[PDB]
Amino acid sequence: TSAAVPAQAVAVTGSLGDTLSSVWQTVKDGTAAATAVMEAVTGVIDDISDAVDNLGVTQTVSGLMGSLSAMKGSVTSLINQPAMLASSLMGALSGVSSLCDTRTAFSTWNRLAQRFERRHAATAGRQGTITTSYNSPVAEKNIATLNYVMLAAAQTYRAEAASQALTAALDFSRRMDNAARAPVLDAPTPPVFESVSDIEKTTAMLGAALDSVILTASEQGFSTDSVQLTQLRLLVVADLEKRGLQLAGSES
Amino acid sequence: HHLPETLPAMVALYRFTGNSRNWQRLARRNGISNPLFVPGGVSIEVIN
Amino acid sequence: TDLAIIWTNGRGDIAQDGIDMLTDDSLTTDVTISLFTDRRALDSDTLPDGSDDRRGWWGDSYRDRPIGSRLWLLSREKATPDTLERARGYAEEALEWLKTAGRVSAINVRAEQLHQGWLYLYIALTLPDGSVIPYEFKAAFNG
Amino acid sequence: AYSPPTLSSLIARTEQNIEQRLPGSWPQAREKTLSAIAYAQAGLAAGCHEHISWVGRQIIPSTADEDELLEHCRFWGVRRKQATAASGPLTVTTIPAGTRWQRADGVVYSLAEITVTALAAGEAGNTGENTLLTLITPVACVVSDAITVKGFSGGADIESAAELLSRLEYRVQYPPFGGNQFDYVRWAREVSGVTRAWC
Amino acid sequence: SPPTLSSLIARTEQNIEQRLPGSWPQAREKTLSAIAYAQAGLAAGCHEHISWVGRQIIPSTADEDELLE
Amino acid sequence: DISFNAIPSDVRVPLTYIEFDNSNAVSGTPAPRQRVLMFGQSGSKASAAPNVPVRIRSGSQASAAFGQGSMLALMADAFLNANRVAELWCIPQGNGTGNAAVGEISLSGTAGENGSLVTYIAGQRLAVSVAAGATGAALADLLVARIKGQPDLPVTAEVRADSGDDDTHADVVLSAKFTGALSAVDVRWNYYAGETTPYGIITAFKAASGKNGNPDISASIAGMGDLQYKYIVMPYTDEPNLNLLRTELQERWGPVNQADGFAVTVLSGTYGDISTFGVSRNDHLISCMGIAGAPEPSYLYAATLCAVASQALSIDPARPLQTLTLPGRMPPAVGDRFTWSERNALLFDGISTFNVNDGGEMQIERMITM
Amino acid sequence: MFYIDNDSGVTVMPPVSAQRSAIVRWFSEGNVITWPGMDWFNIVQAELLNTLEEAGIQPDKTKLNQLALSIKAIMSNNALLIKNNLSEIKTAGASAQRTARENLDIYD
Amino acid sequence: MFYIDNDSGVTVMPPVSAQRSAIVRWFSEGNVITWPGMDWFNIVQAELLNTLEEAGIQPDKTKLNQLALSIKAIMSNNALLIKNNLSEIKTAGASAQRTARENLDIYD
Amino acid sequence: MFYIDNDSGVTVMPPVSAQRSAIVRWFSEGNVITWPGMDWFNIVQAELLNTLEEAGIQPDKTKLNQLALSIKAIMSNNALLIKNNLSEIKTAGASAQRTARENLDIYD
Amino acid sequence: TPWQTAFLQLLPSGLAWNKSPDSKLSALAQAISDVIATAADDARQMLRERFPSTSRWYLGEWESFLGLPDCTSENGTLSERQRAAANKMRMTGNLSRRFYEWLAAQYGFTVRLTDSTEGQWVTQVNIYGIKNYRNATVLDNVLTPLRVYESGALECLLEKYKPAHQIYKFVYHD
């Protein structure tokens, strides 16, 4: 269905926040583990701030930029307190989503998803190494869970944006009348979602990405996180297949 | 009603009343642990 | 593209083909399922058996429509026109759900008695202009 | 998890998984066989979920049923008080060991005036006063009918589950009792006959 | 330690291939593969419920109400 | 109706008689009447003269007139609970040749958990609760008490001990009420799906290898009398008795003696024996059914088959007997049922076959004369 | 005799748990060391005892060639022999000889 | 089935070690304490599984007489049977019957 | 080879115990937990080696189908084959051929 | 198998469907239902894991919660670890010699607490039937030796659980 996607997005974001708050662990202040965790969190904030700065060319984003700057400045306070860290991160993601129109939402969320995927792949490709032996285990766990949660949140927001773009395109099509009428003298959706092959490619990409995310969630951040991501996909892919392709009333 | 063989609770309920949605009530009231194996020979109380 | 039902020895079953099972994307599977699965008999019907059990499916209360056909009520009949008329009516009622949708245009079903002891049903549909070519097979025997 | 999913949700999720994984797209109204396969899978999963819930209810003696509460008692070393056969006097005047008088109801009171024991160990062995009993196997020494001026007593049924759980709780909770003046008084008073003691 | 979802997929595919000789359910976009994936999802849910049934046997890792009991 | 002799001649007071019945005959008028005849043995204390037809209307009357648990009483009750319209006439017989020993049960002990032990003696299930540590002697005593309590079983039991006090290996010796080729029984401790024996209990059954012989039916054939018994049961699948019955039935069905007949029997044996017996007979008055597993004895199936066939043919003669369910009969195990090709080949030897529905009920898939 | 007579075995065989993995699994001491378990021992000794019982040989602890004797007995029961010169097929009955010859294309 | 079905096992068997003793060795509780190791268990399990594979029966867990069925299946696949009455020669072909008669010295 | 190769074996096989229980016994975990002991391992190993030696093959460590090879060799030494139609009785001589024909009732 | 029977019964009933034990529907039903069969086996073994006397997955947790790993738990035998956990979980008792004899014998040993020889508080623990051999069971590892030789398990146990005031004196007999 199409009306049941935002509720599932809200549920997925809530579950991801809860799993981050439940898995995050505290570390000693002066250690290299704390230094690495600080660097990772600051990097995530940097990615979000870059997205907001790209968004701000046309709009006014000063309030969100200031909030992000304050959160970057107060990193050491947030590391010790897990609930505030996850709550603030999801609030920042929702703030980024609050500045996106139906035109730019898919593009900005795709860019953020790629940016987070780069970091997740880079940090997950190094599993067994003599250098990785030196890193503390709790720091590595607290970094990997954060990376996965950020990636999953970005992908879920991208899927919801795609569904909303489909709705906007169908409303644009519905705008024009269909009845026979005489002409009268007059005196006063993203392009990637217009073609059909483009929609097929988008559906394939979304399905593959969410399937990979679920497979990863089967280990780190398991349980509800995966159950919710599977449901989200079964809803988003169904909506794209039915409304996007309109397989009922389309003849070749 | 007796059962000629051990049936799942859903099938046993549907055969006797025709609405299988209340399939947990039969298992709970009879006292079966696994609803998939409802005993065959013993008497079974079915609510219509 | 679901699995296809293949008839052998008077009893249909799913079949394999190369690596996996044989697949079907036509009305053949839909018709052979809607015709030859027993749906729940009414309260007032007289069952051919001496028993008091009516068939159906545990999912009939989960699938928005009764599953199959009431052709099982004619398990033991004598050669009289009443049974032929009843078989015609039951086939029409079982397959009218297709005509309700747009998957078929018209249904023409007739009943007859061929060589003694044969209940012959001739069901001819009218697929629309866009429907895919249906599957084609014959019942087969072995051993 | 904490709450098992509904069968309707299981059905919808499995059917959509199969449909979206297949290469094609199914029409609006169809009777594809894979739908029935998915419904059967969902039913199997729901039955397993209910069994797992039943299993999870049995891990604490407070909510466990009788059979598993018996396993808990067996582990902890508690015993169950079995049924007690009713016994009493059988006034008959005017003999093998297996002489069994019969009540008018149908129960049997055997020999081991005489204090006879009911063969059955249920409460049924409890009878009122002035109830007669007849002999099934003649002894050729006395008349068959008795009087039993005082009715039989005893005859308790099996120990109930609530009492068994309470006794298990007492066994778990009670403290160790070492040497002490009060403990010596209690030990020297628990014997049969002693009605006062000092330490 | 419940099996992961990928391990469950593999186990279901092995079972299907063993029961139907000469078959290869790992093929992409195929009926056996779809059936295996759906069954793996159901089994993953069931195994998660089993894990939650566990982990409350001891008071240390039990939940709140079970710990109080 | 009510016979004029019902009210005694000594009364002249207004009386207001009253009667109750249970049959299915609604009109009360004499339609073309059916008088099914039933051959069968009767145990001791029968109090019925052998070889003379007796009219029975109730299972209680049949039991009181032919003893408790005798195969004639069992068949009469099975037929009566399945078909009410027809009229029953039963002719008791004597004893066979062999002894009455049928076998022994052996039970070990030291049960490891609470449970229930179910024993299917002759299709009748006896369930006894097994406590935490009940031993073999206690379980055998309980089983013997249950067997003696229930009289409808065609067996009586006694208990025998062993030198192994613990792990008692107690033996329950069984003995049939009537002596004949049908005196054997079959035990299947676990029949349904969920049922199982408690862990730690060992059970076995040893059956005597002696061979018996069916009673002769020449006297019963002579005493049948001049009547049209539409369906005969006769659960004696023996060559010398079949010869006499077929000779009498072929003497009937002729133009000179216009009296009809038909025999339905059940042969409980392996596939080769069933096929050979089907090939052997070659007559058009007997229609026997071959079975393999048969937890119940053959005469129960014969009685129920006769009941359903008689009702379905009296209602409408020209209607096939394809799909009818024998009410309350236990089909064989899944592994012992014949396959489709085996049934197809069995229909070519005159042996009618059966089927099993989606439920546990069994169908009468096709009925064919020999 | 053959079974566990070390006064550590139960009289009734415990039920065998259902199949978990389809592929063959072997033992390894080095990434988790494996343990045999009761099912493996029970299955192996049950197979050996079932072969012994199929051959009609009662187990006895003194002898240690009963598997070879069992195989030889299965041979002598269910196979033709070179030292018999087809005698086994001709002591059975005349129909056996008729079938053998008509099979070998030796008829009237 | 007959292999180890526990969660502890490796889908690839570890290679067996090289030979160390040329004389037959045994177990002893007492005078050196002995431990089984993976090699002995793997060898026994592989022998049973390979016998099953040679017979052609796939291993199953519920059944226990599969070794006896394996021996009987090998017996039928390789040797003549009393019940069959020399049907395998005919099944093979006509030249087989010709050569069988030739060996039995039945000329035209 | 087939025996223990962990450098923890005894060259002389320790004697077996007596026969203690008359009924069969099976492994269990929980009663008391079951332990195999040296007797069970020794019996199983000795029987496998005994059948391997009786067939005529010496034990080896590399090969892993030696039970199947043993069954095949026992087959080939004592029973008629299918590939060898009747060459065994052809080689046995003329008396064997005449006895086979006479017992098949092909004479005079 | 009962699970495949349950699956077949769940599947629809009619003429088109073949539920004979040799058809493709049955052959696929077995594969479909075996996974849930294994799941049910795990959920059933949780009932055995409920107690520390028989637990195998949760031995580590039952030992961490009880603080078990100590002298009375033997070297590596899983049976002895289970026994130590199952005794420590339900060990509460008095200081009497009868109770100490019972506690010592519950671990498999055999001692008797006889009167002193030199004082009044110094009771004599006469230990009979000394045996340091423990047979390897089927639960423990494949690499463990057939016999594990452990000594001094009873000594430190009794010294740990001895009365505060009293001092024991151990004597070994045969």
Author numbering:
A (entry chain u): 151 to 338, 383 to 446
B (entry chain s): 447 to 494
C (entry chain A): 2 to 144
D (entry chain T): 2 to 95, 101 to 118, 130 to 216
E (entry chain H): 4 to 72
F (entry chain x): 3 to 372
G (entry chain l), H (entry chain j), I (entry chain k): 1 to 30, 34 to 111
J (entry chain a): 4 to 177
What does the literature reporting this entry say, word for word?
The baseplate was classified and reconstructed by using RELION software, generating a final resolution of 3.3 Å. The simple baseplate is comprised of eight protein components, including a hexameric tube initiator (gp43), a trimeric hub (gp44), a trimeric spike (gp45), six wedges (one BW1 gp46, two BW2 gp47, and one BW3 gp48), and six trimeric fibers (gp49 and gp50). The tube initiator protein gp43 is composed of two domains: a tube-like domain and a helix-rich domain, which are connected by a flexible loop. The tube-like domains from six copies of gp43 form a 24-stranded β-barrel hexamer, analogous to that of the tube gp40, which serves to initiate the assembly of the tail tube. It is noteworthy that the helix-rich domain comprises eight α-helixes, which extend downward and form extensive interactions with the baseplate wedges. The Mu spike protein gp45 is comprised of three domains: an oligosaccharide-binding (OB-fold) domain, a β-helical domain, and an apex domain, which may have the function of binding and penetrating the cell membrane. It is noteworthy that two additional spherical densities, which are presumed to be Fe and Ca ions, are present in the apex domain of the spike gp45, which is consistent with the reported X-ray crystal structure. As with myophages Milano, E217 (14), and Pam3 (13), the baseplate wedge of Mu is composed of six heterotetramers, each comprising one BW1 gp46, one BW3, and two conformers of BW2 (referred to as BW2-i and BW2-o). Moreover, the entire three-helical bundle is embedded between the helix-rich domains of two adjacent tube initiator gp43, thereby stabilizing the BWs into the baseplate. Based on our density map, we only built the atomic model for the N-terminus of protein gp49, which is anchored to the fiber docking loop (residues 133–155) of the BW3.
